[PDB]
Amino acid sequence: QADLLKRGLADLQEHDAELARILDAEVARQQRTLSLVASCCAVKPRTLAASSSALVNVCENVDLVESLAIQRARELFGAQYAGVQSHSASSANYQVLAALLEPGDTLLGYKAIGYGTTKEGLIDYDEVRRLALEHRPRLIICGATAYSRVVDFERFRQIADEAGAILMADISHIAGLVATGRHPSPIDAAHVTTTCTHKQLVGPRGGLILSGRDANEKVPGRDATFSRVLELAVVNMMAAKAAALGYAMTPEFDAEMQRIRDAADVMASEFQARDYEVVGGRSENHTILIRLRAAMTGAIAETALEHCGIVVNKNRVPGETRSSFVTSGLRIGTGALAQRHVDAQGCRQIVDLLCRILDEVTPLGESEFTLDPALRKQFCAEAEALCVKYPIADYL
Amino acid sequence: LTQADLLKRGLADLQEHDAELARILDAEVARQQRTLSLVASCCAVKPRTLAASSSALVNVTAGCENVDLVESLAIQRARELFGAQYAGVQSHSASSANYQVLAALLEPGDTLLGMALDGTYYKAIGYGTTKEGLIDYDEVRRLALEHRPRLIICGATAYSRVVDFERFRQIADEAGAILMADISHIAGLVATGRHPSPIDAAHVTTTCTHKQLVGPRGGLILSGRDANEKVPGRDATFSRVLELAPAVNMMAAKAAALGYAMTPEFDAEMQRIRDAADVMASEFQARDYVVGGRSENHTILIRLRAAMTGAIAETALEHCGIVVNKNRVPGETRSSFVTSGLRIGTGALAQRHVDAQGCRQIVDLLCRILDEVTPLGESEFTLDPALRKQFCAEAEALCVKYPIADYL
């Protein structure tokens, strides 16, 4: 009875055709646009099919979809506990934070204590240690968004276990690599793990609460296991979650994760061969942070690059002398490129186009620039040509 | 590519490769076709609105132009559909919309006469059942003058009669308060002119997009004649403050849902709700069982009799394939959990294109259940062995005779 949705598409085509033009135009736009932004990805069509189930009209099938997602999350991540009802990863974090209430909290950036990065582009774990032994936090939150290196969840847990703290990990940005083993997992390192289904699991907007070896071990104080306390925080997106969790166990997802992982290495190496500095000097994960030219600001780069059809994200660089709104670097993720099945040659072509656009941009201040309209049109056509040579495969 | 082909491949992909899930989702649509639902606000989203929910706009966090185009279509449709001068369509929830408007218009610690009928803000109960099943507007006024709330909220889940939004505005203006209207349960009737509109009477009106408007799980924020008027005590207009001065797949579906309600097929389905309620209210009275003289909306509240308990009534009926909700009556001698009444909504029956003859037969089966079940306790239901088998089969047979039309 998938006829329901197919003939539902037919109702839109006949009666709401205006709306259907915009729906068709976005699919084309997402496919004529080159996307190197780290956490943007196109959700797999199967997951889009489950997101429009008749389970919106809501009952034992609502528990079946829930039980299937819980089982699938536990297999993918090796979780002894799993919770799947979060409508966002932000909610998954706050729900855990609410279950665990005491002023002390250490986080990367309640009485919030903050840590950051070393002046050379790494998490200052020794600062995490010093802050933990001083303020005796309730939990320490680990997990970074723009980091280009493997987060040592084991190190964080060593620090926490000497400061009597709980370790929470947001693996939202590296979830697929953690699931496929390419990135070390925090499932047993962290007491509790949170993740987003959409970013790197190519699924719906939502959240997963997970725990491993500490799931049935007692919370520090409060005479309960981590599984209870988390579960005492009590849908279409359930169906889509289970679809995404299922595809994430397929070998096709393992390949997409290696392509994320391959493209990161060739692109970072190709930036270096053009004397553009990658801050880690290497790429682990799906992200490459490039330190931008002397007069080039990250704000100028992203605005000019989008006008040429490439979307990238400005990011702070180690030793940043500039504002947050106007940076000195940019961040690129190989996520949506893996969905485009870009070979090593294509990744080198993208670095070529990107570095060529920047060499033609004459910065005027820190958020203004000049790019000759003709050169912009020519660059925008090279980008769309690369989009055609490497299309989004599952969208075809 | 096209949205349809992406989705047809998506549906095909979720049958070769993920089949366990496909059976569960396909099982549920069958369950809803054999279950006769008399619940007030449960409905089945239209397939046209459902297909819009598989937009690739989900992948959007200018790349925001098409999301702006979808949004503007929803704003303009919402404004025309309800006759509103301001609209906001980005609410994940009806509750999210209500919370968002409350935060925008109330300062921390402000008092709201929510008339909720069941820390940052203080809430006055507002009751509203005192007038023997009517809203106690006179207490709303008394409390409003005594507590001077910044906000008064109107809109009832289980009311079976028209809410006098104008009367609340009279109360609100006398007590120097803002009026919020939650019309989630009567949205289509206000839409189609059957229930009086709150757009100009209330400063801000909110609505779910699923309960009566047959659309996605979500919320909508509205304002009418008070849109360009500044919030009392503040230097900004209601429209700017309500603008809070990213799920776009739901926003495409809201546009589709708002468009369909403008079509006359929605109007007929609204008349079918209003019509079926009158027939079923009439049959209940002629079988000597309705709070209020008649239904002026989609809800019928029935007082169970002869020590019938709303909890056992609802429990027994599900075993016979009929889904209803227990609901308090004026003069609840029993607990809140064990009511002495039953609540029925005709939204699901309009989607089954049931004739007046069929509505009476459903009441017939319903009363025939209650005339037979023998409450032994206030919760332990009894007297349903093989009689419940033929009764379930008879309900499923009415489901067969009257199918959900738009679900083919």
Numbering used by the authors:
A (entry chain A): 10 to 67, 81 to 131, 153 to 277, 287 to 448
B (entry chain B): 8 to 68, 79 to 135, 150 to 276, 285 to 328, 330 to 448
Mind quoting what the paper says about this structure?
PbzB, same as GlyA‐type enzymes, forms homodimers with two active sites shared between the two monomers.
To gain an insight into the substituted residues involved in substrate binding in PbzB, we set out to structurally analyze its apo‐ and substrate‐bound form. While crystals of the apo‐form diffracted to 2.8 Å, we only obtained poorly diffracting anisotropic crystals for PbzB co‐crystallized with l‐serine and mTHF. However, the residues coordinating PLG and mTHF were not visible in the PbzB structure, since they were probably too flexible in the absence of a ligand, and therefore, we modeled PbzB using Alphafold. The simulated structural model had a confidence of over 95 % and an RMSD of 0.97 and 0.84 for the crystal structures of apo‐PbzB and GlyA from E. coli, respectively. While Y55 and Y65 in GlyA perfectly coordinate PLG, T68 and H78 in PbzB open the space for the binding of PLS. However, the PbzB T68Y H78Y mutant did not catalyze formation of any detectable amount of serine or 2‐hydroxymethylserine, suggesting that T68 and H78 residues are crucial to maintaining the function of PbzB. Therefore, one could assume that benzobactin‐producing bacteria remodel an enzyme from the central amino acid metabolism to deliver a building block for the NRPS biosynthetic pathway.
